[PDB]
Amino acid sequence: SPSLTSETEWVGYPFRLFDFTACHQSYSEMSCSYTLALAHAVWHHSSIGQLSLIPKFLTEVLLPIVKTEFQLLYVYHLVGPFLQRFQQERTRCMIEIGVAFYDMLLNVDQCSTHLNYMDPICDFLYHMKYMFTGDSVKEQVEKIICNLKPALKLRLRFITH
Amino acid sequence: VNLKQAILQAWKERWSDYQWAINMKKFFPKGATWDILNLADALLEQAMIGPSPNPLILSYLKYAISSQMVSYSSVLTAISKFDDFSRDLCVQALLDIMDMFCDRLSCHGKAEECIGLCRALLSALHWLLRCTAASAERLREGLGEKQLAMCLQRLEKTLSSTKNRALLHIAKLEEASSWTAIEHSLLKLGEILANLSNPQLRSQAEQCGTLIRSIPKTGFPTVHAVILLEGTMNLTGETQSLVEQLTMVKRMQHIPTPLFVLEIWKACFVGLIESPEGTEELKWTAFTFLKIPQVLVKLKKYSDFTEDVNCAFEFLLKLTPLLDKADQRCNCDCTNFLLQECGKQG
Amino acid sequence: SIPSVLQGEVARLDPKFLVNLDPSHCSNNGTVHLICKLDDKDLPSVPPLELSVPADYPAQSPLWIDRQWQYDANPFLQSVHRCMTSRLLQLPDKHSVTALLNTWAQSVHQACLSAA
């Protein structure tokens, strides 16, 4: 949407825009206010047979669409809690999501000037390494770390450990 | 028997510190902290006669500052009356005097001692302005000449700490017609070094100048309640109570003015749509339509207010579903009517 | 107010010391600090020095403040500091303030004889 990629008028806290719990207030600001909530619902109702179509569609269709800072947090919210729903049901989801996240990590790094939410993103990386993915994707992560900015490369030595 | 006689007979042979102190102690039954008796007046008198200053007087002044013999204000009073500005070597020596005992100024005494310290630093900065004006005109008449580059190095370290700024500002208020000569030389200070243009000296020099004129994220639904309470029942008052409420709210919590106008308009829309049907719908729509230009005209009068509301509307024109729900009740486009109302208000 | 231990202590202290309380720091509390004044025609001027004694002064080992840059600009003062670090490090435990005061007093002559 141009409200995502082009209209970047909102510079402050974006996580309030990625939750329908904030829409308890008169806080419908976008179509994306609703589409996440059904994404909260439908994928909760979806079994692993329905959920298995999601990662291929993300890694093939929705992969080069993320261009602004908002789409990055939008696709991180798109997988975040449901990773637990992915966790018990499919190890292919762990392999594909480690490969996919570390693929678009360099993709957004190639096409960024300044991003300010690297601290919660690195905390999420720590969380998924320690809780979600373990160390399934390790070797290619080193090469992708070698492709990062040195300031971005600094805070993932423990990821390399 | 004189102090001048005493420093003279100390000068005639070579004495080190310990025997000199022993002689000074046996001479006077009363110490009198060696300052109210004015010891330091003749200490700088005989050290400036020669073009090359003697090291004996410098070694004499070394230990007295390090010990409790000579205080810090007495050196400043003597150097502040140095005037002349004739030779470069004694100016460099005066700069080297400033290198150790200054920047602390720990006054352990009475309140009058601190008042004297404040006026001493006032006259000292006046002498700093005078000596830098002399060192700048020396370079101006010369054309490396790093003498002014070290005078500004002296200048920047005399104002780095916050206590220097506090002392200068608290001495500014207590004294009248004293800071006038400060800007009388400051008007020349900027322009002389602007004539001698440098790639980097101007930045730090005018940073110290701006300091010496300096001596004299998160959504906030708090104001949502402020706007919403007024139109509930106490909407029959004047236009100034709500103004002195909401403008003061911006004082308490850091609020961007585009965010302020964003809240101003979204509250007007919410009070329109979320009002239930009946006489309360009409009352709320009238409240959101007829008192919001009155406060904004006064805000424009008291305040830049044209540019920020454009970004406020840039924020505002994204709320599609909530404000589209208002158009079901209103059966029409309220945006046209309100953006002609703003033009009617000018 | 002040305990009687220090009141009996200062009764037979040398008149060549004029030690008084520190103007800074807290007051009427367990820890006390006493800044010393030396008025001797024999000895030259030195920094006045300041101690530190906690509550229950008997049966404890007190301390002394540290300021290395005050004894600079002269190697004589550095020798005074080195003599302080020499004499005070062999002082026995739980000693009174007379021992530290007198070891501070004698080191001035011990450095003056080397200086002269």
Curated annotation (Swiss-Prot), chain A:
It is found in: Nucleus. Transmembrane segments: none annotated. It is linked to Intellectual developmental disorder, autosomal recessive 18, with or without epilepsy: A disorder characterized by significantly below average general intellectual functioning associated with impairments in adaptive behavior and manifested during the developmental period. Interacts with ELK1. Component of the Mediator complex, which is composed of MED1, MED4, MED6, MED7, MED8, MED9, MED10, MED11, MED12, MED13, MED13L, MED14, MED15, MED16, MED17, MED18, MED19, MED20, MED21, MED22, MED23, MED24, MED25, MED26, MED27, MED29, MED30, MED31, CCNC, CDK8 and CDC2L6/CDK11. The MED12, MED13, CCNC and CDK8 subunits form a distinct module termed the CDK8 module. Mediator containing the CDK8 module is less active than Mediator lacking this module in supporting transcriptional activation. Belongs to the Mediator complex subunit 23 family. Required for transcriptional activation subsequent to the assembly of the pre-initiation complex. Component of the Mediator complex, a coactivator involved in the regulated transcription of nearly all RNA polymerase II-dependent genes. Mediator functions as a bridge to convey information from gene-specific regulatory proteins to the basal RNA polymerase II transcription machinery. This is Mediator of RNA polymerase II transcription subunit 23. The lineage of its organism: Eukaryota, Metazoa, Chordata, Craniata, Vertebrata.
From Swiss-Prot, chain B:
A motif (LXXLL motif 1) lies at residues 125-129. Ubiquitous. Abundant in skeletal muscle, heart and placenta. It is found in: Nucleus. One of its GO terms (cellular component) is core mediator complex. GO terms for molecular function: nuclear thyroid hormone receptor binding; nuclear vitamin D receptor binding; transcription coactivator activity; transcription coregulator activity. A motif (LXXLL motif 2) lies at residues 319-323. GO terms for biological process: positive regulation of DNA-templated transcription; positive regulation of transcription elongation by RNA polymerase II; positive regulation of transcription initiation by RNA polymerase II; RNA polymerase II preinitiation complex assembly; somatic stem cell population maintenance. Keywords: Activator, Nucleus, Phosphoprotein, Repeat, Transcription, Transcription regulation. Belongs to the Mediator complex subunit 24 family. Component of the Mediator complex, a coactivator involved in the regulated transcription of nearly all RNA polymerase II-dependent genes. Mediator functions as a bridge to convey information from gene-specific regulatory proteins to the basal RNA polymerase II transcription machinery. Mediator is recruited to promoters by direct interactions with regulatory proteins and serves as a scaffold for the assembly of a functional preinitiation complex with RNA polymerase II and the general transcription factors. Component of the Mediator complex, which is composed of MED1, MED4, MED6, MED7, MED8, MED9, MED10, MED11, MED12, MED13, MED13L, MED14, MED15, MED16, MED17, MED18, MED19, MED20, MED21, MED22, MED23, MED24, MED25, MED26, MED27, MED29, MED30, MED31, CCNC, CDK8 and CDC2L6/CDK11. The MED12, MED13, CCNC and CDK8 subunits form a distinct module termed the CDK8 module. Mediator containing the CDK8 module is less active than Mediator lacking this module in supporting transcriptional activation.
UniProtKB/Swiss-Prot annotation, chain C:
The chain holds residues 673 to 788 of 788 of the full protein. This is Mediator of RNA polymerase II transcription subunit 15. The gene is MED15. Belongs to the Mediator complex subunit 15 family. It is found in: Cytoplasm; Nucleus. Ubiquitinated by TRIM11, leading to proteasomal degradation. Transmembrane segments: none annotated. Component of the Mediator complex, which is composed of MED1, MED4, MED6, MED7, MED8, MED9, MED10, MED11, MED12, MED13, MED13L, MED14, MED15, MED16, MED17, MED18, MED19, MED20, MED21, MED22, MED23, MED24, MED25, MED26, MED27, MED29, MED30, MED31, CCNC, CDK8 and CDC2L6/CDK11. The MED12, MED13, CCNC and CDK8 subunits form a distinct module termed the CDK8 module. Mediator containing the CDK8 module is less active than Mediator lacking this module in supporting transcriptional activation. Induction: By 12-O-tetradecanoylphorbol-13-acetate (TPA).
